[PDB]
Amino acid sequence: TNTSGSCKGRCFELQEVGPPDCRCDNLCKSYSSCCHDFDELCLKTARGWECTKDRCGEVRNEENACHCSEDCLSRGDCCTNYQVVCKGESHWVDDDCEEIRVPECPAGFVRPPLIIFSVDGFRASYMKKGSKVMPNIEKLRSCGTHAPYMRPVYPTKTFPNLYTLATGLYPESHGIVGNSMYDPVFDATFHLRGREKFNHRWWGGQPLWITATKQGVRAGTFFWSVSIPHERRILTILQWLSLPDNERPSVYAFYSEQPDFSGHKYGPFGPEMTNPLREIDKTVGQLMDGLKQLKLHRCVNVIFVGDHGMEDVTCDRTEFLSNYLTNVDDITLVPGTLGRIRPKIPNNLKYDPKAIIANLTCKKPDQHFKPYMKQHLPKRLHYANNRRIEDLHLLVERRWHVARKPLDVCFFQGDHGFDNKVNSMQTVFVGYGPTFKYRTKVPPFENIELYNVMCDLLGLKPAPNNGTHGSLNHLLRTNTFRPTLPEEVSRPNYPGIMYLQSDFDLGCTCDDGSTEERHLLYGRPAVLYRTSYDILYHTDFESGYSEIFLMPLWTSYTISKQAEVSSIPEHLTNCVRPDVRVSPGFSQNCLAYKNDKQMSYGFLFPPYLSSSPEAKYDAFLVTNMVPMYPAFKRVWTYFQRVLVKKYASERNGVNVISGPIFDYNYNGLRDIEDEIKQYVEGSSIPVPTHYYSIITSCLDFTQPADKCDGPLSVSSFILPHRPDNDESCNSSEDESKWVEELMKMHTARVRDIEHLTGLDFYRKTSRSYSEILTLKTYLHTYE
Ligand SMILES: *[C@@H]1O[C@H](CO)[C@@H](O[C@@H]2O[C@H](CO)[C@@H](O[C@H]3O[C@H](CO[C@H]4O[C@H](CO)[C@@H](O)[C@H](O[C@H]5O[C@H](CO)[C@@H](O)[C@H](O)[C@@H]5O[C@H]5O[C@H](CO)[C@@H](O)[C@H](O)[C@@H]5O)[C@@H]4O)[C@@H](O)[C@H](O)[C@@H]3O)[C@H](O)[C@H]2NC(C)=O)[C@H](O)[C@H]1NC(C)=O
Ligand SMILES: *[C@@H]1O[C@H](CO)[C@@H](O[C@@H]2O[C@H](CO)[C@@H](O[C@H]3O[C@H](CO)[C@@H](O)[C@H](O)[C@@H]3O)[C@H](O)[C@H]2NC(C)=O)[C@H](O)[C@H]1NC(C)=O
Ligand SMILES: CCOC(=O)Cn1c(C)cc(=O)n2cc(-c3ccc(Cl)cc3)nc12
Ligand SMILES: [Ca+2]
Ligand SMILES: [Cl-]
Ligand SMILES: [Cl-]
Ligand SMILES: [K+]
């Protein structure tokens, strides 16, 4: 009855067992529900974890933690060094590396098991301490498939990243948006400590262990109560792998709290870090020795993966909100390496976030954080579409903390949580086994991509997630996913001169094809929603004009290394010309811009780069026009006039695709018409929330962008369309002092832009679709 039951013959059972019965599984301690004898029967410790010479051929003592008796191999009970100490065998790490071309599994193994070896807080650069410190991990890394680093999700904390690993989802989608969270609909608080986190209402998406079970693939329990020592976790996985064919799981997970813990205490470059790193490598060696003893070391796929990195952060670098705000005791702050602010009393009517933000904006010249309303955060973070994410956010500068007041502040030297493009936040990925490539390095990738791959490694169909299935095919020897191009949903018109200048009264005054080959280098973008749009050709650019939103969905042009920048003549300053290809009812009008005292306009193709004086008149077409606040125009003009040509000079030409983005509900997805919330004054011209540019050139920078044979090179941005430059604390200075800094912060993946625009790029190339998918997930980080 309840606790008084026994774990005899049930240690680390994979049976689902619930109250009133007592449990003997991985997590029973965390639920305070183990049988009274779980500890003495299942957590055996006697004689340590390694065979000694005097133990070989012993008589089995069931009290020992692991065994060196003759029978132990057939029971899965051996210490992992048994054959080394007693049967003249070599440690796995001492064995020369050899390509595993196909799974070499014992009979009864239908497929290679997958083992996920997760390490908390393993900064990518720890890898550089090499075989001197971590010989087992180095053999995995050098013989298998490795990336130089893996990008975590924001915030770069444990619970958001490991649940992202398990689901393929951004935190805003799976719900674990922090290690601590307040849900205002539950009116409840999620914390690492305590019981609330065990409630299923917090956890969204479909994690890998559920996907597997629902598709008939058995998982071992991924989670381990903190009192189960690491050696016992390894022995338990190995004993599960010894199970009969009709019980043995196909996917396993080990977890280590190190080196996060020592990282927090000693900082990432403390000499104390060698010892946790050695201990982790020893655990890796115990696993691989155990797999060798099972004849499974050439049969199992092993993933060695971290959740985030670690930065130098000390008490001496703490910003205090009480230096900026008068009554900080009235707010609650999720503090440290990020900030989330809400009133201490939920729904307190006196809470004044616009006044708080004002007092936090550019108030010190060396200010070590920046306040954002969450819809203004860089889109690449994907950190806004969830009720658990406070409206007010603080992005904290690397190496610093933010706290409410000094009564809240030595004992720690490291921490993490920062912007997920910060180098110290990057973590590790190594794949080793029959399905991974041999001795292969792959570009860094994002942890959201791994759920699709683990599904591939298991024969599973992934639940809908934020990975791009196929962008990681290059990690794998086989079991690749064959991606298929999405189908165009709306086809374009190619209008000619259906009209004449007399048919147009839009209030606009002006004082005065084979383009596809040169300007549309990778095919036209496919439109993947139902809409109405026209292709418009020009000497210097091409565009896909939308009759519904009154502006191009995309504008595409190529700029050579040698092109010239030219001014706008003073008589063409206010020139806008009707487009005689496009109806008057499907055009913007300049009257609305004359009436709207806060809105101005800009051009997607820049007049500054037209090839000839004649060609420049195309740039002033009403169909090249987009609404832009004067504040944004300070950025956009500097981009068009200075930076595009600088990029062409540096990359040997560049192809540019630019356009608008509408995301008023900040969910990272293309708005439907009903969701657009702002229009030019007294008109129906919608106002974009962001503008994008995709800048492509030849990876081989010695070939011009327009004559490129092989792989491509891409960088992109999604700039916020804002009525002020408050985000840029140096914006009073010249644009050369702050615009590029702004753009670097809003770097983006082509894939981000695709979600936000409903468009599909790079459909016509001499490259495999898999390579293209990789290109679309690339993020240029400028670190
Ligand atoms: C990243 O990938 C994810 C997954 O593909 C994308 O998220 C999906 O987005 C679509 C489009 O809006 C949305 O579509 C349908 O939503 C509802 C049906 O919702 C219910 O059923 C589904 C199916 O089981 C379930 O996944 C949903 O879970 C969500 O809601 C619960 C309860 O609040 C949460 O516990 C859970 O964490 C999910 O929350 C996320 O999604 C909701 C939106 O549904 C957000 O409000 C929330 O803050 C959080 O972001 C739910 O139980 C249907 O009525 C509607 O008409 C659509 O057909 C999916 O629901 C959504 N799925 C998930 C898992 O988020 C996401 O767009 C991708 N991001 C980018 C940038 O590409
Ligand atoms: C934003 O920062 C403001 C400071 O830059 C801060 O203003 C300060 O608020 C207090 C009380 O609201 C003022 O009043 C106290 O001092 C003056 C004498 O100078 C008296 O007139 C008052 O009765 C009272 O004694 C401070 O003067 C004022 N400081 C300044 C420089 O104006 C705001 O409170 C901050 N806002 C938020 C939302 O935190
Ligand atoms: C899911 C929110 O974060 C954790 O639960 C952290 N964690 C802790 C504290 C103990 C533990 O044993 N595990 C194991 C995993 C895990 C995560 C993903 C995958 Cl794919 C495989 C394993 N994560 C944990
Ligand atoms: Ca949207
Ligand atoms: Cl957090
Ligand atoms: Cl909280
Ligand atoms: K105006």
Ligand code: NA
């Ligand atoms: Na400013």
Ligand SMILES: [Zn+2]
């Ligand atoms: Zn962690």
Ligand SMILES: [Zn+2]
């Ligand atoms: Zn940590």
